[PDB]
């Protein structure tokens, strides 16, 4: 049995455990706000994460493949758990302040590159 981190009620199988190894039952699964799923590109842009940080840094982060509503022939979106992405970003960059400084210096470097190109 697996004990939920929110209610503590024992359960055998749950969606979060099956898909992301998250010990949380479906009753406490707040997939709307707390357990929202984000696309891989969006997560990489927001948290400045790389492929190695997502697939090689232990523990590995699982994902759910879903069909693209806009175009059938286009790439299927890879959805990662927001909590796991946040935890991985905090572990890699140390603190949220480091990430907030990193995004600012990245946009400053982008502006520097565009003005240099001009």
């Amino acid at each position: 049995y697996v004990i939920c981190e929110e209610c503590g009620k024992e359960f055998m199988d749950s969606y979060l455990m099956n898909h992301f190894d998250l010990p949380t039952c479906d009753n406490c699964r707040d997939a709307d706000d707390k357990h929202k799923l984000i696309t891989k590109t969006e997560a990489k842009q927001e948290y400045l994460l790389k492929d190695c940080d997502l697939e090689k840094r232990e523990p590995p982060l699982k994902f759910i493949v879903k069909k693209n509503p806009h175009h059938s022939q286009w790439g299927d979106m890879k959805l990662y758990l927001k909590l796991q992405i946040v935890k991985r970003s905090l572990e890699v960059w140390g603190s949220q302040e480091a990430l907030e400084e990193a995004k600012e210096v990245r946009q400053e470097n982008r502006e520097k590159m565009k003005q240099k190109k001009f």
């Binding site: 699982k62 994902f63 759910i64 493949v65 879903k66 069909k67 790439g75 299927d76």
Partner: protein, 677 residues
């Protein structure tokens, strides 16, 4: 000679061992010591079988208790006969190098038609009626009535085997299918029955995939043979497709018409137990209701039984009893023959499948036909969606299941396509005195326009002209045989029509003969025969076919046959018919398999499978081209087998037709010189 592995010495008929064979033996010994499954990939069809058999025999000699039974499931009968003759050669080598016999028995298994001696059933070409006629000739009632010696024509091989062939064993001497037939006819025994009696007292045995993938015969042929056994599936690049087809059935107007025709005869015979007599009568109308419904598609794998339990209001329990009723009621009814009776059995099989297997399947009804879509044809097919179901009953019953073929490049998709626990991740690339293959990817043509077989560009005149030019000036450099595979029959015929319309097909004709492979089996066979006879002399020939055809894998282009293999575009399976997309969705929401990744994997698997048949033997050499710019992208090149990756240099990944022709000329000129051993 005696090859000294890390903990054993193994005798090998050939004195010289290539490094690939030695590494393969190392890996197989490691897997056997690991007591686990595995997946292997080798580039040589010949020389793998001898090494496999030699290592198996060495392991059995060293550890008789660890390994007791060996299975060598292959694709067709020629593979069975060649592996049997290779095993015979190995046994002859062991006898001539050792001097004493061993109590090892090896037999080949096949259908009733392959192993039969009665001249009254050989001439006919009905594979679904030979088993029924054999059952009618000899069965439990035949044995019961033989005591009274009834004066009626019946098979008598079993009536002698049961009284004389059940005592004398065959401890030594591996027997081929022809040898088994000869022994049966000289001893007055049935080869199939003696094989059934002697499989228990045997060391090795070979047969087809269908005897293990299909549950209806795997239990009968393998129930308690050996708890710990080794099974290997050579040339199993398309194991998933056959596993899917194992639990796939089809229904049409002919099937239901045959069922309604034969139910009256069944009722007439019966009126001359009751749990099924009235049960079978009303099942036809439920499925014929979909015949009169003018709808595109209905999907309800879990709700099909719910819908059945509403129109006729039948419980789910009696459905599972069809399998046990088939072997009981039919033998009591004394069926004369299985002709006009197979659809009744397949209906029971479908009912049992839908009653039992409903977790990873889908029901699809397709009211579409080729060139005549909507006249009268609601086609119902219980298409399987998960390849793990047909492979579950063998992984849990065996210890060292091995998947090996010439095209198993991605070893990370097979363990997730089917439930599997690989411990090997091993591939081997052949080495020779010189590079025996010249793989290259041709992108844009001489006009610097891509020759990609994209759907939006299939009707483009420029790409068709570029393909024709490539086939023309390629046919002037590679001699005596070119094999070209197209994506589909429709695209192939539309391209050759455009070639005929222009004055370009004549230039190809005046270089090599053009042969077109069609759906007709006899026409395909005669076209292959005349292609071979044209390749024997200096005329030369072109074999135009489809990648997903019966000729792509049915024949092997040995040296001097098909010196060049041309792939006109990436072979992508038809996304229509709403069958592939169901499997794509199932793999998306079950195994987290990307749809694009799976489609690319299937396309590259087919391309590599049909392009790797030009290299059979060390002395054989061949030219391999890929006439599509999409091949140049890394996501598709990475799916090619490792024995082709290192020979595909980065220099020729997007070269035009002229530079491809120049590379082909240089390769062919440098491959004609004598070499060594």
């Amino acid at each position: 000679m005696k090859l000294n592995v890390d903990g054993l010495l193994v005798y090998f008929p050939y004195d010289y061992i290539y490094p690939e064979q030695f590494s393969y033996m190392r890996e197989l010994k490691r897997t056997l010591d690991a007591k686990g499954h595995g997946v292997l990939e080798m580039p040589s069809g010949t020389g793998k079988t001898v090494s496999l058999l030699a290592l198996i025999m060495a392991y059995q000699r060293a550890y008789p208790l660890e390994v007791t039974k060996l299975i060598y499931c292959s694709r067709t009968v020629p593979e069975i006969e060649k592996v049997i003759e290779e095993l015979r050669k190995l046994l002859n080598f062991y006898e001539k190098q050792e001097g004493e016999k061993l109590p090892f028995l090896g037999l080949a298994l096949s259908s009733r038609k392959n192993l039969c001696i009665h001249p009254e059933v050989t001439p006919l070409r009905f594979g679904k009626d030979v088993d029924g006629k054999c059952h009618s000739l000899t069965a439990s009632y035949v044995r019961a009535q033989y005591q009274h010696d009834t004066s009626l024509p019946h098979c008598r091989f079993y009536e002698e085997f049961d009284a004389h062939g059940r005592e004398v064993p065959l401890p030594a001497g591996i027997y081929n299918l022809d040898d088994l037939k000869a022994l049966g006819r000289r001893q007055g025994w049935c080869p199939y029955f003696l094989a059934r009696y002697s499989i228990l007292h045997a060391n090795v045995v070979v047969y087809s995939y269908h005897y293990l993938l299909d549950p209806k015969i795997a239990d009968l042929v393998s129930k308690e043979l050996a708890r710990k056994a080794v099974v290997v599936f050579d040339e199993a690049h398309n194991i998933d497709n056959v596993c899917i087809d194992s639990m796939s059935v089809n229904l049409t107007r002919r099937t239901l018409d045959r069922c309604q025709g034969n139910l009256e005869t069944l009722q007439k015979t019966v009126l001359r137990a009751e749990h099924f007599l009235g049960f079978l009568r009303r099942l036809l109308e439920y499925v014929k209701w979909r015949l009169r419904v003018q709808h595109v598609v209905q999907e309800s794998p879990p709700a099909f039984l719910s819908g059945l339990a509403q129109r006729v209001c039948i419980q789910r329990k009696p459905l599972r009893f069809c399998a046990e009723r088939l072997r009981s009621l039919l033998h009591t009814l004394e069926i004369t023959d299985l002709a006009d009776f197979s659809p009744l059995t397949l209906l029971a099989n479908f009912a049992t499948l839908v009653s039992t297997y409903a977790k990873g399947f889908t029901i699809i009804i397709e009211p579409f036909d080729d060139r005549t879509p909507t006249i009268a044809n609601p086609i119902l097919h219980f298409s399987c969606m998960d390849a793990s179901l047909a492979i579950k009953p063998v992984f849990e019953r065996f210890q060292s299941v091995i998947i090996t073929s010439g095209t198993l490049s991605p070893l990370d998709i097979y363990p997730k396509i089917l439930d599997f626990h690989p411990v090997t991740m091993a591939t081997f690339t052949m080495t020779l005195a010189r590079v025996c293959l010249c793989p290259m990817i041709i992108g844009r043509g001489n006009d610097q326009v891509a020759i990609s077989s994209k759907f939006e560009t299939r009707e483009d005149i420029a790409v068709i002209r570029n393909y024709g030019n490539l086939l023309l000036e390629m046919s002037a450099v590679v001699p005596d045989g070119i094999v070209a595979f197209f994506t589909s029959y429709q695209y192939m015929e539309s391209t050759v029509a455009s070639w005929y319309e222009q004055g370009i097909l004549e230039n190809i004709q005046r270089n090599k003969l053009l042969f077109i492979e069609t759906q007709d089996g006899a026409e395909t066979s005669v076209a292959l025969e005349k292609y071979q006879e044209a390749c024997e002399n200096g005329r030369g020939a072109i074999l135009l076919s489809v990648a997903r055809g019966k000729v792509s894998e049915g024949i092997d282009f040995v040296h001097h046959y098909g010196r060049a293999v041309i792939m006109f575009g990436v072979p992508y399976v038809y996304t229509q018919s709403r069958i592939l997309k169901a499997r794509l969705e199932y793999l998306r929401d079950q195994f987290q398999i990307r749809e694009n990744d799976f489609l690319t994997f299937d396309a590259m698997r087919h391309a590599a499978q049909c392009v790797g048949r030009a290299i059979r033997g060390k002395t054989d050499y061949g030219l391999m081209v890929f006439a599509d710019k999409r091949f140049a992208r890394g996501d598709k090149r990475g799916k090619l087998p490792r024995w082709i990756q290192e020979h595909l240099t980065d220099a020729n990944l997007n070269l035009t037709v002229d530079e491809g022709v120049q590379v082909a000329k240089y390769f062919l000129r440098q491959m004609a010189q004598p070499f060594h051993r």
